[PDB]
Write a protein that binds this DNA or RNA. Sequence first.
RNA 1: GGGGAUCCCUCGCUCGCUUGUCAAACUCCAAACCCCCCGUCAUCCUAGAAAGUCGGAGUCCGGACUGCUGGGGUA
RNA 2: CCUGGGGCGGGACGCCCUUGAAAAGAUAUCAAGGGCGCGCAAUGGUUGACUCAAGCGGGUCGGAAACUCGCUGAAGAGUGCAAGAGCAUAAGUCAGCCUGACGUUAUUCAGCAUAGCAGUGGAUGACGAGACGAAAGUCGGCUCUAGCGAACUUUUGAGCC
RNA 3: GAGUUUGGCGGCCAUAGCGGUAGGGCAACUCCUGUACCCAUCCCGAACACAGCAGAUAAGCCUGCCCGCGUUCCUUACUGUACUGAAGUGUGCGAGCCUUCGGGAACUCUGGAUCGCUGCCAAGCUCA
Lengths: 165, 159, 96, 174, 92
Amino acid sequence: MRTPIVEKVIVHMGVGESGQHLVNAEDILRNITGQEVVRCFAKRTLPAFSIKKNEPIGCKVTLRGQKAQEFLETALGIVEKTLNRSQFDSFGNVSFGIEEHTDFPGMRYDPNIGVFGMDVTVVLKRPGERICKRRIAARKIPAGHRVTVDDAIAFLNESYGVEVM
Amino acid sequence: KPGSMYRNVRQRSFTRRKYMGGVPGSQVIHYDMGDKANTSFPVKISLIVEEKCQIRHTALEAARITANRHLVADTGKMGFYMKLRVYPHEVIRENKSGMRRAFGKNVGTAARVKPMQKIFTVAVEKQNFKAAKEALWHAGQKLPTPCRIVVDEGAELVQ
Amino acid sequence: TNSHGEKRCTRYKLQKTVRERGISPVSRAIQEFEEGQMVHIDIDPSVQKGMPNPKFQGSTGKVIGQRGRSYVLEVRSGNAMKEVFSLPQHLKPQKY
Amino acid sequence: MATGPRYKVPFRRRREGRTNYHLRLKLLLSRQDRVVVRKSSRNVQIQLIAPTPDGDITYSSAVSNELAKYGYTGATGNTTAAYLTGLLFGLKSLQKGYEGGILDIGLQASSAGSRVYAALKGVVDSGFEIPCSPEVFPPDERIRGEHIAGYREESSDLPEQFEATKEKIFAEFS
Amino acid sequence: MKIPKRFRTYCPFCKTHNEVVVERVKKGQASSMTHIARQKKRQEGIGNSGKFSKVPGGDKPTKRIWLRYRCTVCKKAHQRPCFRAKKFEFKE
RNA sequence: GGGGAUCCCUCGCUCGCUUGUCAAACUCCAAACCCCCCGUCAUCCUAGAAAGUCGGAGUCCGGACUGCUGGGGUA
RNA sequence: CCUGGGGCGGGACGCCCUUGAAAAGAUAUCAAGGGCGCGCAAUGGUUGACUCAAGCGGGUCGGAAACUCGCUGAAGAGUGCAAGAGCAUAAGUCAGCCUGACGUUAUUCAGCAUAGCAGUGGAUGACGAGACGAAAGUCGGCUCUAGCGAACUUUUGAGCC
RNA sequence: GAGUUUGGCGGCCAUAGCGGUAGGGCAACUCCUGUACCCAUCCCGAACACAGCAGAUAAGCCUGCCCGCGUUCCUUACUGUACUGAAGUGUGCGAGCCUUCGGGAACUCUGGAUCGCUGCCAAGCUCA
Ligand SMILES: [K+]
Ligand SMILES: [Mg+2]
Ligand SMILES: [Zn+2]
């Protein structure tokens, strides 16, 4: 039971400024995911962004199950099944930042809205990572049960045929 | 201001600089002299004080200067290694009125050393043992305590 | 100047050792003492309720009654007999 | 992760993630026996535990495996089994002589209609005094096993056999 | 600091928790027929008046907020020991 | 981040492994004295323990030696 | 008034913490470090759910300054404000419901060791009503120790004389 | 009736921690499979919750081992050293220090051990 299944897939849009643009970004992200998105809040006021503490900045959504698989396949198609080594984490996680939301069918470009980019992260776990997430008897999984970069790329090839350059 | 003022140890330590204000910086610049990247010096002599005393940073600097001059002149620029082992951690203060609110202001730093404690260690070759001995004798003349030289390594290499 | 609070000079008296900081063993909070039993006063700093004065830290008291959760102890302080109230978290039976 | 002498390691039961010592302290201050209801994925278990300086002592113990002799063939790890185990635990504790306690669910989440509260209702309905509020109990139909209508036709016999097991378990302590 | 104008608390008279309205207490004018006023007028003559020629003292840096809690059911008020605040408002 | 368009190359702090030093208001450690309690011996005690009540006070300028590196101070 | 004469300066003139202080307690100086004369209907109570600081790696002009993912992380954070102490399935963070920041009352501590002394303050209880919670519990404010004042007088509250 | 495997609750709270290595599951636990339902997500059946036919010991868990860091205990040297209670017509110009009787470290070193011990109950089992 060492096949690195997909624990979850996360889509995040770091707009950096709240308001009408934030609502448009969250609506387009919810459309492209088919699931309610949640607003991310800043943590330190900065005159560069002119924002304050605890104020909406971006949005992200967690996808698990066949929804995650379908979104991951679409997102990998937008990069044409391509993902290089430097994308991967030290423990089997990847992420890559696309620019045009127009590449997801079912949404139309708006002159008012513009085009918002986003970053997608899929976290690769193993079958049994509930040990570090359940409430009772929660133990950290050993280092021999984690996922390596080469294991992750082999899984991606044997599961999606997403070659790694 | 003679060294006999802040010489005897009658008091507890005064070293926590976050609870004091404005300590003058120490005069002692270097603590390692000669060839610092050499460890295969066979003979190693040290200067140990034989009384419990406080040595001011200026006295330490004077002793270090005189010993370093003698060593550089006799053994050469890299014919020796010299280490000043103790740092001046104690803060010396003076009451500068009379005895009202007499808790002093910080005027310097001193090293509080114990009897038989090493102050300076010098490592040299076999042929420079007497020169190192002479240099450490001159250094001890600048210190507020009687001193004695001891051979730590290579006793059989001198006699 | 110098104060006269209860927590006067309690830096190490009311401090815990490094590996006993945190939630204390809960068995000490549900121990029962009989009348006339001799118990030590060893204050637990983490239990901030029902704590006797630190002046009685290190004293052995005799249990003379109970006042709810707490125990009433007769504790000798110099030449006086003081009535000290303590939760069992701060108490400890004397062993013979 | 003992980095050094100043590192503090938690209690062993806390390191294992099996006990909450703050909750345990709150429960021990009752000075009453705790009705300890624990559930695994395949069955449910109830204990009557009193504290000792040397360690906990158990007074009474019922497990889901005991129901199968009384005529229960359903899954031991659902609401009907939990209720039946609670009933057997309460009746057995009454037979022993112990008749009071408080509910100790430990780290288990407190959710209305849970298996833990079905076991609690089984304990209550046996006459075993234990404080509680009725709004956390499961509906009587799903204690009878109305969830059998979900996917399984074979599960459709759960209500009558639950009644039969209940009557036999009452008869054993009647 | 702010306190709600109305909140539920204990009524000492009806002996239950009811809604109570908080009202600031205004100091009244001293009666001219009290025994101290009559004594002041009686000790008034020629010369020093004793304690009646004392000038009033100073003030603390902050005074307490004198509040009165009237039950909405029995319409009786009770006043409790009160805090000491520079700025006091009612939460509405 | 200090020095004289590919930031063409020089490197102070910062983080570790060894070296050398420290702490009234630091402690992973840790005494000897001492303190509460229990037992023991010892001493006192029915020629009155411990406890209690009441009468009369003086006294609240102290000083010294031996230690505590007592604190302050050049002393 | 204190005061290394007095005065000038200052307040060691009330309260709280660390050291001095010599491992019980006590312990002085115009001894050292200082702080307080407040702030807060939430910055309070309770329950649930979570876990902090800081690093490392991944992620788009979203820069090595934002947000997000993973790993490490007994706490290196936060807990209103001094200092010290306490706290991690929390005493921290967020959310739901709330007002116990409740009326009355008894002891014992400690200001004031031993060992008398006040206004107070703080622990444990009782009575009467509640909030949260399955319950156990917790809650007499804000983790513990500062934020305050006699008699007389007036004014205010409830019922009486 | 004695022991074992597993499960639950614990006591002491690192001798138990961090790290590495090799073995097991018939029952039990677990990962694991779903989301009609009770219950849930500031989004996500991830969690919690419910209902569970399969697959699996790769994890948790258990057993064996490893001194690697951390911890705890012993041993040798330091050393009866540092410090210290009592006394002293012992001693120093002095800051001080000594002798006797009684207590007595810490660190480091030599060589070892320490990779938890343990209480109650239950259930499977292994019996004369
Ligand atoms: K004078
Ligand atoms: Mg005067
Ligand atoms: Zn009323």
